Structures are given as structure tokens and as C-alpha cells.
Amino acid sequence: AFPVHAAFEKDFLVQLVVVDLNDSMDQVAEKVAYHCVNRRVAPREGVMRVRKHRSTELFPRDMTIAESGLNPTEVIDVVFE
Amino acid sequence: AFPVHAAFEKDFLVQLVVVDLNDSMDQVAEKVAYHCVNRRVAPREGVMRVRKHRSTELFPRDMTIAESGLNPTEVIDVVFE
Amino acid sequence: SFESKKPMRTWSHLAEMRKKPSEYDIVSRKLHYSTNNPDSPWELSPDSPMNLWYKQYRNASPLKHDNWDAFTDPDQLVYRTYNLMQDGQESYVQSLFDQFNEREHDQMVREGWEHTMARCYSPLRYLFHCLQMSSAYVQQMAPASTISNCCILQTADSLRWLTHTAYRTHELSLTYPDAGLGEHERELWEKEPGWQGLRELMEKQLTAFDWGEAFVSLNLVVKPMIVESIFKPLQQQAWENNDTLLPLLIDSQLKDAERHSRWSKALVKHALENPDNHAVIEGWIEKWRPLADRAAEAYLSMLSS
Amino acid sequence: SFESKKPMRTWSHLAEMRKKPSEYDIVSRKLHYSTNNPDSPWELSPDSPMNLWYKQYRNASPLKHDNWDAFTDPDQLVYRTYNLMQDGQESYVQSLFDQFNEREHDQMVREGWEHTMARCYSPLRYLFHCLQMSSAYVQQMAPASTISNCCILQTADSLRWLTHTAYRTHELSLTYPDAGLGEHERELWEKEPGWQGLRELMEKQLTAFDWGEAFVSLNLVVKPMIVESIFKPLQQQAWENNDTLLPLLIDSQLKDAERHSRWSKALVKHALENPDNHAVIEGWIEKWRPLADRAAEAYLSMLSS
Amino acid sequence: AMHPRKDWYELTRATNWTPSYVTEEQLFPERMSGHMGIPLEKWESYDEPYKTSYPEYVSIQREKDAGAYSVKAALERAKIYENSDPGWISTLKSHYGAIAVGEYAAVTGEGRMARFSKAPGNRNMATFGMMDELRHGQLQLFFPHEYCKKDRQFDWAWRAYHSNEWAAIAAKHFFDDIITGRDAISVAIMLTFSFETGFTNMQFLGLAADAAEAGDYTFANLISSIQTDESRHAQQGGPALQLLIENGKREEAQKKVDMAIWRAWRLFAVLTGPVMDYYTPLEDRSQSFKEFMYEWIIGQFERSLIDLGLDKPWYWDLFLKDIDELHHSYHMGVWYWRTTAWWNPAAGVTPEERDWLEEKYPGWNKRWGRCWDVITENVLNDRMDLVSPETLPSVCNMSQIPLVGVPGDDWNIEVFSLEHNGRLYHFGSEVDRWVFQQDPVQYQNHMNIVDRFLAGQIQPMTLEGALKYMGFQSIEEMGKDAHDFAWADKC
Amino acid sequence: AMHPRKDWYELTRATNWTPSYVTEEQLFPERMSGHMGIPLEKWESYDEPYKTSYPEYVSIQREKDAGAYSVKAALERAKIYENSDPGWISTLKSHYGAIAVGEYAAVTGEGRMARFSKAPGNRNMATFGMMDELRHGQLQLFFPHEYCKKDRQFDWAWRAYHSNEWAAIAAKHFFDDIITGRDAISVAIMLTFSFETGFTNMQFLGLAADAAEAGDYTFANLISSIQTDESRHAQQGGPALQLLIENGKREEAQKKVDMAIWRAWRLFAVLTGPVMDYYTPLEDRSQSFKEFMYEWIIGQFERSLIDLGLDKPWYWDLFLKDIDELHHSYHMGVWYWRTTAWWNPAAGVTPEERDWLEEKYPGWNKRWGRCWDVITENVLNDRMDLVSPETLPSVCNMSQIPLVGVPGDDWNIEVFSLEHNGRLYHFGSEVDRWVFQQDPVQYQNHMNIVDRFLAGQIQPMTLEGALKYMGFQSIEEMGKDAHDFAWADKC
Amino acid sequence: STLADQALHNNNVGPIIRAGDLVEPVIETAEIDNPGKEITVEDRRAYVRIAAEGELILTRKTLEEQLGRPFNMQELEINLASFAGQIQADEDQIRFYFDKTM
Amino acid sequence: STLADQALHNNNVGPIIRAGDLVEPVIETAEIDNPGKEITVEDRRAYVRIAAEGELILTRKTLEEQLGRPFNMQELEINLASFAGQIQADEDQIRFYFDKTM
Ligand SMILES: Nc1ccc(C(=O)O)cc1
Ligand SMILES: Nc1ccc(C(=O)O)cc1
Ligand SMILES: Nc1ccc(C(=O)O)cc1
Ligand SMILES: Nc1ccc(C(=O)O)cc1
Ligand SMILES: Nc1ccc(C(=O)O)cc1
Ligand SMILES: Nc1ccc(C(=O)O)cc1
Ligand SMILES: Nc1ccc(C(=O)O)cc1
Ligand SMILES: Nc1ccc(C(=O)O)cc1
Ligand SMILES: [Fe+3]
């Protein structure tokens, strides 16, 4: 269990989403979208990506949060390519 | 000039109508109707008659108020046969 | 014929004032409609008994002015401000009563003072009630509402004084139950010589039905006499007898009495706009002053006994 | 889990009373949320400076009770009724000031009384302000809103007394401009021996930061001393010197002082529900009484000079 | 400590004494005192049941005004004037005009008692009564005054009693008869007992209920506060009544009550009746006029009258029938001759209102409805000339109000006439004629508006001449239909 | 005669003296007094510009309450509760809950000054200040109390500050920081100057304007009367400010003002912003939130700040942008997580309202409108599960409010983070992080709701567990959509 | 006149309280101080008509308790807009009553 | 920030009067006691914002005249809900003013 704070593209806030130490930037992006898409954000085409908050670099879609070196409660964004 | 108080059949009040000493119970009835019929009373068929207020006897349609012995400001009704 | 007109900023009768109408102007001025028709003050048969009364005792008064309504209470008091003012004065007096009772003031007065109070003070309730009745008469007969209003407040002040006296008579009797306090006042008012000048004065005054004579006798003659010959000597006697409450109480009553004299003087000034009124007023004062002086001498003689 | 519940007729915390909640209950009870979390009185870092202050000087006080909030002002005063009551008392005092000034009271005091007032009365403004500051401290530290409310009103009463003193100091100087009235009070408070016991007492009292010791020292020790050793002797001296105003003024101030003692005694009764508190309270009284007695002796010695 | 009022109150009213320097009759003349020969000593039994004293009075009354004025101040921006139904505005105009200066007149009624009553308790309570009416006159000038700048008809709050306008004459003929024109004991019985425990509850509390429904809290709060004073000083009447009965004067007492109640009824029927059943918006009618009558006059007042030992008035049955009928006709008269009023009468006969009226007064549509049918038609056809009068109504010589009856299907109207000293007088009921006959010197030489018109006192002898005579000072002041006839559109 | 206040006033504040038996620092400890080393003698220059004295205070304040209470009494039957828009009722619930016991806390701020300020004039004015806040706490408990019997959410007028509910924690973290948690001089500057001349005008007068439009005069009259006291005791701040500047402490003064204004802004944006632009019925919006800000904060307050000799805050431009944006997002957060509120948020996004919002905030529909579009859809399709949260929002470590940004077309959101003593903290702006860094000992060991949740203090770790932790005591108390979603029907 | 007869033949006594802070407390006081009497209340918004058969007492002590603040009996006048029955008042209570039974 | 700049750069001073009996009299008083100053009034129903450039004086004497009843300056506090400018008050008048000109 790994708590993070996630800002989903086009939403209005940052939320606490609890992911797992072994999830990939595809699974994390999915867990975040759950609390956003079809709630305050319209669903769309494209691939959901994860980056450290306001970072220029995206995490590889396959990397786990463990491999990412993120610390718990650190902030991330979820955007579209 | 001869002031009387006149209550017209089906109206709601008594009014001051000034007639002339020489008018007949046809003319008086006409002068009263003027301030009543088509104002608060619906027009109708029949002959307009004049009697002393609440009297059982009607004045002849031809008698003048002078001949009637009425005193000024005395009360009269105007009803239909 | 008729014209179309703008709304006025105040009553039609005040619309020409060159100052914004005050609360006093708005609620006090020109309210006696009974002065509109000389022939028939009241809306009844013109010769009904009360119409005849008013035509004789108001309209036909020798005290004459073409615009009584222009009179102004120099204090411009209205009901609302009267109560504010008097709740202030009366709360203070009641606080004095409470505080002096707590400190057992009455026990410490000079020996026998209780008897002087029972004879000279407690029967004042009759005198003050006479002032109350008389003030009400002037109220109902005065030719302008601004005058009558002053009289209404003065009637209330008279009852105020009456009430002070009743309260203190009773209170004093709790310390001095063997002096006749609250028991013999009527007999004193009726039989005691020191009271007879005053009683004769008021009985006759109460039968002066002309509004002008009523006003002059009451407010210019009787009431100032009471200030100078009753209120102030009582204060002096109280001082000589270690009564420290009465002088304070009377100072509060004296505030009312100066107010009555203040509006009275203003009415006189207004009336004297008519040069004829000087002789009228002067005559009524001369007529009543001897009775007033005799009332005062008898009272003072009794106070000093 | 959660349940559906009916609306309550009053606040949830008063809903079990077997009497209808009064105005006092509704607006006064259980308003200090700062007593909810022992670890962190205020919603900040639990070791912030004010949190440490409160944990030491309130929470850790040796004066202990499991339900301080159950305390009740025996008078059940709220802001609204305090102002009604004090507007009554204060209007009366102001009326006394006005009336006694009108009658030139101050001119008639015994020769030299002005000097006794300048030395013994006017510097009271410093003493009363100390009471004011101290009352505010007890207010901010007390463990229940019903206690703090009594302190708030007491702080206002202290300023009331301060204000009386300032007013009369100035007024007296208008008749006696060569006695140092309104000029030398600070120096007297600082240097005059008769004031030094009192000044030492208050400076030390104001540095007693435990809420319980603050309360006991102020309301059980200092304030009753002032009643018996300052207020009442002053009345006696005023009487001996034909000052009739001061005794009346002080009687009004004494009403406030009895009220403070009345709620203080009630708090003590509440605290003594805990048998442990008897020794605590008794100890603080013994600790402070000598300073209080010395303050009183020095003052009285000076009053009698 | 303070001593309780019960321990010193008797001394406040121990003020009767035996005159020696003038006679008892000179000091209390019958024409002003009305003691009916009852000696001074008997009057000391008078015991006012609703006491007060000077210190309590000023304190309490200060509190009463603080609330009245604070509420007015907090609600100045509620836009009652702009946003209220104009029928409601006319209700305010009518009330203030008909009442403010009448209140001030009532001071004189109280003063008559304060000076001339032989009962010491009555003289003291009348003193507070004088003060109360002063309050009431000043309140009811102060409140409408702010509306002068909006509407000239509000000037009548002050002007009405100074005019010869018909409702002002009706008001003064009544008030001058029972308030300012009679002896102290008559005032105690006719004013404080009959009028003030009898009818004022209707206008000051019944109307307040409608005002609260209308959302006009300034006004409801005002008049309900005013009536708290009435509740106290009105209690001077009962003990005078009881004293008269104990001293063998029950017939005299009964006749005064009978007279005053009927006189009050006719006036209330022309002012309060139309307000409650027509001017007040339908959704704001807490109860009908009749329902309020049954609450306040029958259920409360008449029951109290019986409890004190008096009898139902001889005219009881006529009164009950009148409650069903009179005001409907008075309303019609006020509205048809609306141009002579200082307020704007609402016709109040939209279909929705006629349904309510039929429910509250079964058979209404077959009666007054017949006339409103004719009226409504002329309006839907722009014959506005037939909706304005070209003569005077016949006016009662007692109440100064038009002579009316039941119109329509079962038409019935009766005038009760009287020759007296060579003059012919006309009354709208047996009771009004009876009242005249009880005291002809009071009434015989009074001339109503019609009399004056026929005597040549109103010139020119035309509608405009009469409006001028009535004191109107501009076009705006003259009464018109409250809704500018917009109610016709619901028809 | 009486002598005028100007002749004896100086003696009322001639109360400073030179301590001899304890030291000056023992008598006025820096942690409680905050004199910044300025010697006693310099503080005697302090001159409160809005004076009063004890006799005037009790008399005037008696009059203030008489009006407040009289008005409440006269309007009890106006059916505000039953007849008002539920958005308006929620505005009352929010106000009373967030304010009443906070007012009572402000007594302690004033008391801190009354005891510990070195300025004698400040100690006396703070004494009236203690009294004023006592009035305000008691008024704002007394008024809502009558509604307990109608609605359990009104119990929060008393309960809120005793709970760990999120808005209560936000309110206490702010008030404990600027009112009860700092030295006397800090209180003078942060509370009486910054918060009280700066923002309270918005909530107590801006909201009163909306209340008057809504026809709730009891409430408008109440809070506007309350602010008359503020106007006087708030004037303790300016002269402390001027004294600090004169004595070389301008930087310290500027920083305190800067800190307090921003802290106040974030709280006002989450409570007053949604009230003015969403809860208050559209027809009752006297001005928009931004417009009121420009009137009260920019036009009045910031101009006064400059006049006294201070500078615009360094964060001026961020503040202006925030005024355009922040509250729209705060509203959305309060509403989405409405179940954790003690009032019932109104969504306030009917087409008519969105038009107003677009006019008041051009580009709104392309931003917040995008989220409300999604929300509105779920409601029109009974997917109510998507309109309730299944996690926590990320919460600021300063303001205790969710971390937000601009949604929609030009999405932009920024969190400002900080490692401190091994712990990671998150702030919703540069200014909030700056505030923390100004005084870490004040804040560092505080834990917000999210922190507590992650530390295991909230059990069970579910929506119900959190609601229990927040002090809710029944289903009724939990916040819901004000109109039960009926607004969707306009869509 | 059967409607009118029924209206007249009542023995209802009690205060009419104008809208304000005394309405609820007076009703509660009427219920408490007259146990075993049925208290009727007719609400006209601007005032409330409170009644009992034959007699209805309001004590100062109960009214003060129900009102929740210090209260003197004479203050009731601030809100007593009218009353049915004859009145007997003092510092401790007010009594509304009839001498006759109809 | 041009809107914000324009809002800040004002010299408006004067009382904000809460709805009640002081609104009209204070506006009239502002006009009378500051001749040759333009008085601006913004009406928010619950309060009115009254202003002049640089300085605005209200004298007790004029306010008393415009209010129409006896009035002491300290009573203004009953209705002075806020104010722009610094304040200088005494028994004879209140002055609202700025030290700077923006
Ligand atoms: N009271 C009256 C007033 C006027 C007239 C009249 O003008 O004839 C008659 C009586
Ligand atoms: N002020 C605080 C209150 C509570 C907590 C916590 O529960 O961890 C932390 C800080
Ligand atoms: N128009 C009137 C209004 C009131 C009264 C009264 O209270 O006696 C009398 C007349
Ligand atoms: N009650 C009246 C109504 C109207 C008239 C009239 O128009 O002359 C006279 C009296
Ligand atoms: N010609 C006239 C017509 C009507 C009236 C009137 O209503 O008073 C008077 C004269
Ligand atoms: N919640 C609060 C309300 C008011 C005040 C204040 O006036 O200082 C402070 C806090
Ligand atoms: N500001 C907050 C809003 C909501 C929550 C929560 O639902 O836990 C916490 C904080
Ligand atoms: N599982 C949870 C979902 C939501 C919340 C919350 O909003 O506080 C808490 C726990
Ligand atoms: Fe009246």
C-alpha cells in the first residue's frame, strides 16, 4: 500500500489515491482516473500517463512506483500523450 | 325644483334625486332610473312606478308631485308593476 | 379648478417651513380640529352642551391670539422623549429610595421630624393631585395641540410627584408607625389651618373654567408659589433635621417644575405678541396672587410651628 | 452505525436538562473548545508557544475538577442583562455626579480633604487598572466559559471603577487646582510608602500565571481586602470630612464587588466538590494573605496621616 | 430595599376630599362629571382592575416604543409601498387617516375623566390614559409621515380630521359624541368600556392579523403594540359600570352601552368591513369580517358585558342580521363614490373573490353580485361614465353614512324617518333613530353633507364643488379604483 | 453639570507605571506581550482614534441589543425557515456554525491585549473589545437556537468548534493562529487591523446586503449591528501599526499583515465565496463575490493600508488572480464532498446561474463549467454514485482546505511542497508555504485531516469512519444538495 | 342566531398575546399553571388567543422559567394585546376569570 | 490588474451606514457639511456607502437637525457599520480623511 496525491488532467483538485508499491504507471493512472473520469472529467481517447507533479519527464508506462523512486504522499500528475 | 330621496328596485341604496314640482310619476321614475339602471341595476321590461317609501299604494302614473302632496326630501321607492 | 401637484416632503401644513420638520413638528402641530369652526367646535348640534361649553370657556376667552397653533414647547418634548427623560430621572429617584432605605436614613432624622413630615409633607398628595386635575383641565381646553401637549406631560409630572409622596409616606410610617403617616392626611387637608389657604386656593382655581384664566392661575400663580413657598422651605427644614433624602427628591421634582415654568413663560411670550393680552394676563395674576400669598403664609406658619 | 434522530429542543449538550434552558444556559455554556484536547488546547502544532503556555498554566494547575463547565454564575448574567443592570447603576451614579456638582458639593468638604483625596483616592486608578488587567488574565485562562464570562464582566466593572476615579479626580481638581489632582498620581503610586504594599502586591499577583492561583489570589485575597481595607475606611473618612458623594459612589462600587465575591464563592463551592482542592485553595490563600495584610496596613496608615 | 406596590398603592388614590370653599357640585358639575347625583363617598369604591404606577409606566412605555420604532427602522427597505397590493396600501391610507388625529382627540376623553370623575382611581388611570392616547396619536402620525414624499393621499393621516370629507365627518360625529362631547362617566362607559373593549380589538388586532399575512410587520407590530395600552386603560369602564349598577343606575348604564355599541358598529362597518373583505388581498384574509366579529364582538365582548351584569342590547337580532349584510353595501357605496375618499378602494370582485364571498356569505352573488355584474360589464365596455356618480347618496342623520339595503334578487331597503322640531331627518336603522331620540339636544341642529348641499352651503352644486368643500387639494388626492380596473381582466 | 469626555479621558488611560517589585519583562513577557523590545515609555504614545468610555458603552450597547432583539421578536412569524430558498437556509447554517464560537474565542484575543499590551489605551479599548465579542458570541448562539427544534444542522451553531469536522478545523487553525495563539501586539495587527478592517466587512456587511435582498431582515439587521462594534474595536490595530513603524519595526509589521491577510483570504474564499456566488439565490446576489472583494478589500482596505504607511503585500498579483478563480474551485470541493459539511451546499449551476457566472467571470463555462457538465449528466442519469466521493481530497497543511486549481479547457493546478524536519508538507499556494516558513514552531507538528487519516487516527478508514471522527451524530446532520437535485430539471 | 348563541355561550378566558417572544412562553405557562384544564390556542399570526374554561392563571415564576430570562409581572403589558375574562393582577400572577357560567 | 489598480487608486472617505433611521439623515448631513464636495452614495439595501474625496465631515449639529430629534455624536455608533478613511471623532463632529493622495 502506497499513498500518493494525484492531479488528473482537467480536474479541479488533487486527491489522495492509495496505490500499491508494485503498480505500473498504467495501473496507477487507472486508479486515479477512477476518482475523476466520469465524475468531473469527461472521458477521452488516448493513453493515460504519470509524471511527478509539474515534471517535464513522463514515467515509462511499465515502470512500477517502487522502481520510480517516488516517496509516499509525494505529488503526481496524470495526463494524456 | 323639488329634492326627494329615491330607492330604486334592486339597487343597494337611497339617493338624492332632484325632480321638478310639475313632473309626473312617469317623469320622476325616469329621473331616478337614470342614476340606477345600467349602473347597478340591470335594465328590464315593464312600467316604472312611484310610491311613498314602503307604501302599499302606488301613485297614479299621471299625477304630479305637486298633486301627490309629497314634501321635499321625503322618501319614495321606484318599483315595477 | 383643481391642479395636479407633486408629493410634499412633509404634511401640507408644514411644507412652508424653511427647516426640515423635526419629530416634534411632525407629531405635535395643529391637531385640534375643534378650533376650525367657531360656530361649532365639535361635529354635533352646534348648541350641544359641550359645544356651548367650548364656545364660552375657550373661544370667548379674553386671552386672544390669531395663531395659538404657532406656539412651540421650548423643549420640543414628545411622548417618546418624555419617557426617555423621565425614566432617567425616575430610575435615579427610585435608586435613591432603595439606597437610603438600605442605609436606614429614616432612623437618623432629628427627633420629631416624623411629626413635621406627617403634618407638612404627607398631605401634599392632595395638593399635587389638585395640580394634576387642574393640568388636565388646561389640557382639554387649550386652543392648540402644542399647548395641550405641554399640559399632558405636566399632568403626568403632577401624578409623579403625588406618587413620590405616597411612596415616602408609607415608607416613613414603617419606621414611625405612631405619627399618623398614611392615616390622617385627609383630615389635615380638610381641617388643619396651615392647609386651608392652599385648599381654598385650589378649590377656587379648579372652578376657573376659562382656559386662559385656568392657565394663568395654575402655571403663573399657583405653581411658582409652590416652588418658592413649599418646595424650597421643605429642603431647608429637611437640612436642619438631618433628612438628606428629601432635599435630593425635591431637586428632582424641581426639574419638572422649572420645565412647567419654562413652557408657561414661552406661551406668555407668544400671547404677548398681542399687546391686548398684557392687561388680561396682568389682571388674572393680580386676581389670584392674594389667595396664593395667603396659602403660602398659612403653610409656612405651620411648617415653622 | 449512524441513526436518524429527531431535532432537539435545544443544543445537544443541554438536551438532558430537566428544566427548559434559560437565556443564560443557551449563550454561556461549554464554549471553550480549547479544553477538548489535553495534548493540544489550540488547533496548531501541539508544542507551539501558546499551547505550551496553556498546558502549563491551565491544564497542569493543581486546582482540579473533572467538570469545570458545570459551574454556574449564581447571577446567571449575560451581556444583555449586564448592560441593563449597569446602565441602571451607572445612570444613577452619573446623575449623582451631575446633581452634586450642581449643588457645589466639593466646595463644602472639610478643609484639607482635597489633599487626602489627592494622596489616598486619585491614585486608585492604578490599583483598579491592575484589577482590570488581572481579571482579563483570569478570563483568558479559566477552564470553562461560564467562569470566563464572570471574569469578563469583572474586567468591565474594574474599568468602571477606574473611570469613576478618573472623572472625580478631574472634577475635584476644578475646585482644588493646587493639590496635584490628576498630576502626581503616578509618582504617588510609585514612591509613596502607603501605596507600596498595594503596588508590590499587584505586581507579584500579575505574575502568578497558574489560572487557579490567579483566581484565588485575585478574587479570594486581594479583592476582599480592598473592600474591607480601602472601600469602607474611605467611606468613614468621607463621612468625617463632609464628603457625602464618595460614600454614595462607593456603595455603588460595593455592589459590583459583592457580585464578584458572590460568583467567586460559588466557584469555590464547585471546586470543593473535589476534596483535594481544599488544601490547594487554603495554601494559596495563606501564601498571599500576608502581602494583602501588609498592603492594607500601609494604605490605612497613610489614610490616617 | 423597595416596597411593593400593593403596600402603598392605596395612598396614590386617596385623593378625594370634602369641598368647603366651593360646593361639591361646583367642583364636579354634572354636565362635565356625569355622577348622576351619586355622592363623593360612593365613588371611592371604584377599583381599577388593571393598575399601574408612574415609575413602572415610564419604564414599560419606553420599552414599548423602542421596539415599535426599531422595527420600523429595520424594515424601511422592505418595499412595502412599492411591492404591496395597492389594496393593502389603501388599507394603510384609510387606517391612518381615520385614526391618527382621532387618537389625539381621545386624549381629551381621558382628560375629561382625569379632571371631572369623582372616582380617585379613575382620575389616576385616566392620567395614564391621556399619555397612552398621546403616544397613539404621535405614533400614527410619525409612521405614515415617511410616505408623504411618495403619495399625497398619505397627507390625510394628518389632514382628514381638519376636512369636511364625508368619512372624516362620520368619524368626528361619532368621536365627538362618545369621546369629547360628553361627561366623564359617559366617556368611561361609551369610550373605555363599549368602544375600547368592544370594537377596537377588531381594527387594531383583527387588521394586524391581515397585515402579518400581507407581510407588513411594521404595521402589524405597531398596531398590536398600541392595543396593549388599550387593554390597560380600557379597564376604567367596567368598574364605573359596576358602580352605577350598585347605586341604582343600571338602566342609565345599559342605555349608554347600547347607544355607544351601535354608533361604533355603523362606523366600523364602513371602514373595517370593506378593508377585511375587499381591500385586503384574498390570500391575506385571515378571517372574514363576520368571523372576526363573531370572535371579538360576540364571543369576547358581549360575553364580558353579560359577566359584568348587563343585558344583551335590545337590538341584538338586528345587529346579527346587519353583520351579514351592512358592510357589503357600505363597500359598494365607498367604491362607487370612491372619488370622494382619500384612499383608493379596491372593488374586490374578481371571480376568485366572489367565490370566497359566496362561501363566507351564502347568497352574496344573487345580491351584491347582481350590482357588481352590471358594474363589471360597463368596465369591460369602457362606459366609464356609468361607473362614476352624478348625484349624492342619501346620508344618515346619525352615522353620516349612506342609506343602504340589500340589492338584487331579494331587494329590501328601509329608511327610518323622523319629524322633529319641524325638520325631517332620515336614519338607516331603528337603532340610529332611537339614538337620536335618546338625546336630541346633542344632534338636532347638526347638518349632514346632504343637508348642507340642499341648504346651499356647497358651491358650486356639482361633484367638483363637493370635492372642493371636502378639502381635496389636488387631483392625486381623490380616490380611484385601487388596481386601475385591472381586476376586470380576471372577468 | 457634567464634564466632557475630552477633559478627563487622559486620566482613564494614565495607567502605565515603572515596575519595581518584579521586572518590566516579568510583568510583560515577550511571548504574551510582543512588545519587540520597545520600552514602556514609547507605548504611551498609543492613541486609539475611536474612543468610548464606560458610561457611554453600557448605554449605547443596551440600545444596540434592544433593536436587534426587538426585530427578531417582531419577525418570528415571517416564515424565513419554511419559505426561504434552502440555499439561503444553508447560508445561515454555515454562517452561525463557522462564526458563533469563533466570536467567543475572539474574547481571548481581546483579553490577551487587555492584560499584556504595553499601551494603556489599548488595554482599555481591548476591555470593551472583550465585551463586544462576548455580545457577538451570545447573539449568534441565541439567534440560531430557536431553529434547533426545526433542524439538527442548526445544532452546529454551538457544536462546530467542538468537532474535528473539516471546516471547523480550518476555522480553528486560522483563529487559533491569529486570535488566541499569539502575543498581544500580533493580535492587534493580525486580528484587529488585518482580519477585522480587512475581511469581516465582507461576511457581516456584504452578506447582509444579500440577506436584505432575500428578505431576511432579522439576519441582515443582526450582523450589520454586530459590525458597528467591529468598526470601533478594530481601530486598535492602526495605532499599534503606526507605533511599530515609528519605532523601527516596519518590516515586522508588514510581515504580520501580509501573513494574516492571506490566511484570512483562503478561509473566506471557502465559506463566503460559495455563499455569495452559489448558495444565495440568483435574484438576491447584490454583487458577485469578486465585486464585493473589489469594494471591501481592494477599494477600502488596501487603500487604508497604504494610507497608514504600509506597502501592498508582496503577493498582490497572485491574490488578484486568486479572486478570479479560487472560490469557484472551493465551491466545487465543498459540494462534491458535501456529506462532510454541516450545511447543505447548493450546486448553483442552473442555466440561468451559469449565464450570470459567465458574465461575472468570463470563461467560467469553459473551466468549472466543464466539471459541472459531467456532474449534471450523472444526475440526469441517476448515476448518483458518481456524484459522491470515494476518497479524500488532498488537504493544505496551512489552510486545511483542499488543494485546487483551474479545471477544464486550460487546466492548470500547482501544489507547493516542503520537506521540513524529515516530514513532507503540501501547500495550495506560494504564500501558504511562505507563511509556514515564517514561523515553523507554530505549525510543524500540526496534522491535518489527511495526515491523521494516513497515521491511522481515523477508524474505520472509510467515509463513515471519517464522518464519525468529524463529530456527526445523526444522518440528518450530514450535508446534502440544498435542493435535493431539483436544479437538474432546469437543465 | 344559533351560530351567534353558540358563540356567546362560552366561558373562555385568557390572554391574547401579540406576535413576539412572549407567545410560546405564555402558552407553556398556561399549560403548566392550570393543570387539569385544557388550554386552547388559536393562532392568528399577529396574535395568539389562549384560553381555558372559567379561569386561567399565569404566575410570574412560571412565566419567568418558560421565558428564560428575569421577568416582572408588569412587563406582560408589553405583549398582552387583549384578554377574555375579567382580570386580577399582582406582582406574583395574573388571573383571567368569569363571575358567571354561561 | 488595471481594474484592480483603478479600484485601489481612490481617495474615497466616509461612513457606511446600516439600514435604518440614520441613512437619509447622514446623506443629507454629508451634503450640507461638505459644500463644494461631491457626495457619492452607493445603495446596498442593508447598508449605504457614502463618500467624498479626501475628507468628509459629519457635525453633530447638522446630523441632529437632519435626523429631527436630540442626538449625541457617540450614538452614531449604533448605525456606523464601517467607514473608509481614518477617523477623527469628538463630541461635535466626526471626520473621515486620508493622509495620502493616491
Ligand atoms: N357640527 C356642524 C358643523 C357644520 C354645520 C353646518 O355647516 O351647517 C352643522 C353642524
Ligand atoms: N492541533 C492538533 C490537533 C490534533 C492533532 C492530531 O490528532 O494528530 C495534531 C495537531
Ligand atoms: N380613532 C380612535 C382611535 C383610538 C381610540 C381609543 O383608543 O380610545 C379612540 C378613537
Ligand atoms: N357618506 C357619503 C358619501 C359620499 C358623499 C358625496 O359624494 O357627497 C357624501 C356622503
Ligand atoms: N352634481 C353633483 C353630483 C354628485 C355630487 C356628490 O357625489 O357629492 C354632488 C353634486
Ligand atoms: N469567527 C470570528 C468572528 C468575528 C471575529 C472578530 O470580530 O474579531 C473573529 C472571529
Ligand atoms: N477540507 C476537507 C474536505 C473534505 C475532507 C474529507 O472528506 O475527509 C477533508 C478536508
Ligand atoms: N474510504 C474513504 C473515502 C472517502 C473519505 C473522505 O472523504 O473523508 C474517507 C475514506
Ligand atoms: Fe388609542
Ligand SMILES: [Fe+3]
Ligand atoms: Fe384607547
Ligand SMILES: [Fe+3]
Ligand atoms: Fe465580533
Ligand SMILES: [Fe+3]
Ligand atoms: Fe471583532
